[PDB]
Design a protein around this ligand. Sequence first.
Ligand code: ADP
Ligand code: ADP
Ligand code: ADP
Lengths: 505, 500, 500
Amino acid sequence: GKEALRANIAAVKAIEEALKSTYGPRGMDKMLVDSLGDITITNDGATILDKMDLQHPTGKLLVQIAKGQDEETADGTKTAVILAGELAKKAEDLLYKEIHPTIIVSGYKKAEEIALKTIQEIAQPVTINDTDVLRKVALTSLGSKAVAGAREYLADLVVKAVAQVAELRGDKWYVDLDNVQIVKKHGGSVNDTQLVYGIVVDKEVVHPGMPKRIENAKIALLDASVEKPELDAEIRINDPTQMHKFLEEEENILKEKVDKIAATGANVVICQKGIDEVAQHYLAKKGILAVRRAKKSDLEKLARATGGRVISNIDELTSQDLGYAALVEERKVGEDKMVFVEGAKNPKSVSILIRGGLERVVDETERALRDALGTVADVIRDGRAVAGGGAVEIEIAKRLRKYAPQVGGKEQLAIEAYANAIEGLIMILAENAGLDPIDKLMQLRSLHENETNKWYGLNLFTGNPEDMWKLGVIEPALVKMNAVKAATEAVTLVLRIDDIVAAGK
Amino acid sequence: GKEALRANIAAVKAIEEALKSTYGPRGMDKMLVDSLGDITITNDGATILDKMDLQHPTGKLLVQIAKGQDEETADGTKTAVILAGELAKKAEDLLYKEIHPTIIVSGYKKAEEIALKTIQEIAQPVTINDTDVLRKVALTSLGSKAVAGAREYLADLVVKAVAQVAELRGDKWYVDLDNVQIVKKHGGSVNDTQLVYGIVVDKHPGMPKRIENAKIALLDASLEVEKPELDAEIRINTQMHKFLEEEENILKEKVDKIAATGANVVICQKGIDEVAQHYLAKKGILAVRAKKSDLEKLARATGGRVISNIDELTSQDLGYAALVEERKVGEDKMVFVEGAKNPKSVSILIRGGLERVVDETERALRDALGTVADVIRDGRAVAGGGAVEIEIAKRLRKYAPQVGGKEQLAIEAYANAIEGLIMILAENAGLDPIDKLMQLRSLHENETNKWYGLNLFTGNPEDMWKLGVIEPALVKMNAVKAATEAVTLVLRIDDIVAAG
Amino acid sequence: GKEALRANIAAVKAIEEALKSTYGPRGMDKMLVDSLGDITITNDGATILDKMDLQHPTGKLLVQIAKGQDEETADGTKTAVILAGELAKKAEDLLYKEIHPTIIVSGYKKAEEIALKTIQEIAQPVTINDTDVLRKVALTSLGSKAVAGAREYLADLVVKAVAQVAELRGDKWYVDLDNVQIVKKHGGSVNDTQLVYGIVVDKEHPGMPKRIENAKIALLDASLEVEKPELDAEIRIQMHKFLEEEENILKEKVDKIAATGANVVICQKGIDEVAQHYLAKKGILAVRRAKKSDLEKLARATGGRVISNIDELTSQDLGYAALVEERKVGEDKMVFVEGAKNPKSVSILIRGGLERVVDETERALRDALGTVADVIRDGRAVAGGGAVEIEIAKRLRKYAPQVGGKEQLAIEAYANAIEGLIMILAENAGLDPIDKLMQLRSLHENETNKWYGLNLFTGNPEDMWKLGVIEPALVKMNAVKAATEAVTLVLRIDDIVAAG
Ligand SMILES: Nc1ncnc2c1ncn2[C@@H]1O[C@H](COP(=O)(O)OP(=O)(O)O)[C@@H](O)[C@H]1O
Ligand SMILES: Nc1ncnc2c1ncn2[C@@H]1O[C@H](COP(=O)(O)OP(=O)(O)O)[C@@H](O)[C@H]1O
Ligand SMILES: Nc1ncnc2c1ncn2[C@@H]1O[C@H](COP(=O)(O)OP(=O)(O)O)[C@@H](O)[C@H]1O
């Protein structure tokens, strides 16, 4: 049974070894070449674990635990898995001393609970009012990613965008990120990006003859597409003057189809099907704006943000169901055109237009932005925040070291190992920064003899212990707290296994 | 993760090694034999990277970065990729000293920013007025290419041609190269080439071949008949005989509509029906059998609009010209739309004895146009021939001490990597690289002699500016940015994982 | 001819690699097991190169150059050979750039001359008066060795001892270390050691006076044994009287010497046991075989002459002393000739608990004597700990630009090779070499902080001069000359041809 655990532990350390390079802001990236041939370079753990497949089932479960977090932000996964790795690494050293795993687990459980407690007790509170901090958080979150052009601009836009959707529910701050629309274009600098308080539709209008500007536009959201009379009736013809009139009836059918909708009268209509090129002219004749196939995602985000309902059947329409907007417009941002539904009736209306010079590079800003949104939303929803840069881990360590003596012997060693495994993560951080890990970590914890200097962490640039909070190195209290729970979960779920009997074939 | 970086760096140095031969005016060429069998010899990096395919993805991204320069000219790509190569070469030596890559990147970033600053501060300003300089620039740009016959003539024509399109937009000089038409013929010397201030079209004997004050009708419709086959299979039962004439009357009805306004020249991008020829020739109208490119360039340059549908015609929207003519330049004939209404109207007729050789002048000319356009749009220019790099080097060497230690070494390496490029230049010239570079930088103890660079012919350090060795300040500046970009984007990778 | 140079350079780097561990105060030691079986641990380069034999002739010449330093102290040899190593290491990198060796040599020559100049210009003057500094120097010199017990005591005794022998010759301070006597005993602490201003004889009849006042010393370099009549005459057995004649011969031998009447006699031969009683009968002190070394040191220090023949004696030749005594220092007894007539009279008694350990203090003391003597004779001293090398480096880096190109690179390489030595120092101290060196040179932007060097204990750049880290200006200066000598004498060789 020891070889099986050795195998599983090896499996974990393999992942830790894979990701260890990418940890920290001054980390390393990994390239991934699609079978198609498309190249994708990244350090974001979610994408790495995604594209990098594993055959070892414990690996699949491990990734399932680390990656499969409840939260929208992929931030904290790397931290969790690396920690799991370190825990397993020390665990091995505990096993070498002839300690039955259940003991190690029990010690790790105490250690995790107290880690959480230690995070709780130190976690400085933060209010949505203290906007600058939220900007610092956004900065820290998005800064770590490959793109570093105009971080301040983006972070600013992030905080401003997030603060808009937030609402008081039972005096508790609730936020729904589905309320934020996110659209992408190719070409253009990073500065050319802009937020919109209305709903943006990434499309070109169906006809040049339509009004491209409507004031106080009401929006009709129709999820309907011709009729086929072949199976209904064999279209037999032997007399040529007959069919000619048979034709016009079928156009009159379409007219009958559209007239119903023309009766109530819409200002703008959007459907998720290829628009027939005759309806264009008839809709253009009335002075109505239309759009070609937009995806259901934007339609559903349009639905709640406009104060209307999306309608499956075009015959069941009611005059209340249709959304209401203040301004609709179309414009050229960069080279291509886009549609903009500005000043929607719903107060929690937000959109963001993103742009990158290269089509593959703009995708990084997406993955960098999503986390920058979520991470801040998680600061808002929680109401606590903590200075990263190693200011946390060492406190957990010193805590567990001070607590370990008075837990009884065999757990104590597991707890101490836990503390060392927590500490070693900062060393991993420093390794990636090119500095001496030991020297710096010891320097750090040696500076924590004073409780005032609790926020002191390593700056990977100066290479010197400095106050992380003042330097704008803040992170969410929760996202870093969950990493410990997922990591402990994983390691315990590795040490809890004795053998595998998987069914091949 | 070290082996992956070694592989990528190797991948870069492979490209550097491929191109290193072709760098500089006195460089080497590379032959490329098409699968068809056609042979193509060239040194132009774009074509080399084009025809030479790479399987290594980092290579594809590398070429994507180097080629993927914002500007119209392929000039500067070689410079960039070679520099990237040198940077990687020194980087290796930095890694051998146990320096984590992020440090190297940080140092290279500082080095790049300061390189740009150093280019900015020294870059002599240049105005469109100082035409001779622009000629010297054109010369330097086009001279490096395989063809060296009548460089002065061409450069002159280039500068004259470019200066015509330039316009003041918000007191800032804007230029659009789409305004320049470029047509090619086979056979004839290099001197027989000429520019035209009107629009040249590279294309019935009974039509008037000369029209005064011609109005040009731009018809993007098939002048061919309409096909009643799919419409109606016609069964023969003297009836069909008239069925014929109706169908000619259709064409007459088609043309008469267009004959309403009364235009003197018509052009369409479809095979012209041989009955419309006689009817159009009967009126005394000139016609032609042409690509949409020239039509779109004709559109804006004549003061008219290209017409999609022949039924929607208006009496405005046909272009206006002063003179139209046709002539034999060399063996074949060409059409010339001279004295267009739009002021920014330009065309150029190019000719080479051999059909494959005239294509080189094209690739040599495009860059010679862009390069000068980039001098105009920017408003700065710098003497090449190594006068730049050594200053960057000395700058970074003087700046490196006061940046902190571990960055300082990366910066110094950067400076050495910048310097080594001139050595590469000298290697291709057959001279001793070290001796000459050191000779150069040793002459820069005096700032007056800042423009001193190597002459590849005399082999002696001389003032490059006075010898007409000038280049655009921007195109050489972008190379550093793309090169740094690439190298950093190589050192930023730790491992690759392909799917399936 | 390239492979021969590669081999020789390899040969040098091998030695550098051998010694690199032992460099600096916080260095490493090396154990050496004699063929006899006796073990000897040491870091002192002289002993390492001694006991470690090399077959490669260039190695023998190399050690011959490094060891073969003009000066009394073995200090500076390691520094020299390591520097030679670094120079060769960079030289390799210069050769890789296709630079003919003579160029490298020329550059290294300029670099060496300017290194010497740079040492001259910065070298703070020091006078014999500023005794505390001399103590700091002694400390620095002796401190690096294995023994660290009671360094202050020893250094103090060193300075006091050396200052006594120094004499004004043409107003220039001359010192002769042959004037200092050095004797050793086994067992006893390091504190139990003491200096004596008279001449100490390390030796043991009980009937003789062991204390004489104002003793005149007779230096007899003749066998006090009988003369052998065996070869002269095989005697057949009267004999009883034949005996007494032969005692009367000894009496006749001694009486002659008893003429002047000296109080102490010393000879370097086993003393006949009959002369003992006759000499003891007069009330004279004698000693058993002492070595000629102490006799020659006794000769000049007592104001007398050593006598080859006992028949040529004169009443003036004999030395004069104020006090003679014998005493038990530790377990064994020793003879002490105190208050000699010659003013430059010095002796030192050294003692270690272990017989092998006391030998280290010897080798540590000799250098501590010489090193200070070299500060006195020169009149200059310099703060070690890296405060020197970085200045040489910055100097050569600032000077290199204006020497012409191909030399400039050799000079820069020299500077880097000088710098790298401190890194080697820091490596042995367990700290990061690069970081610390860069930290050092970055602190030298201010000239005031010129003496800043690395402290191997705090790990921080600090003023070496104030911390008592001073060394002789000359001994460190000669190392550069011997190192350059060696490296140039390696790069000057193209091939070797032996007689097989
Ligand atoms: N500006 C910063 N300065 C110092 N440390 C930072 C900074 N930003 C982030 N970190 C550190 O980076 C660690 C991990 O960040 P990163 O690897 O980019 O994402 P993740 O949190 O998913 O691992 C955190 O533990 C945090 O302490
Ligand atoms: N007449 C010249 N004298 C010296 N150097 C020149 C001259 N013309 C061009 N060069 C050098 O050639 C280099 C590159 O030119 P070339 O290889 O022909 O095209 P590209 O600009 O794409 O590299 C420039 O960096 C410039 O320094
Ligand atoms: N106390 C000290 N602090 C710092 N450096 C020292 C000290 N003592 C000696 N050194 C350094 O040690 C180096 C070599 O000294 P050492 O090994 O003792 O003898 P040697 O000169 O024969 O190698 C010198 O370059 C000097 O700078």
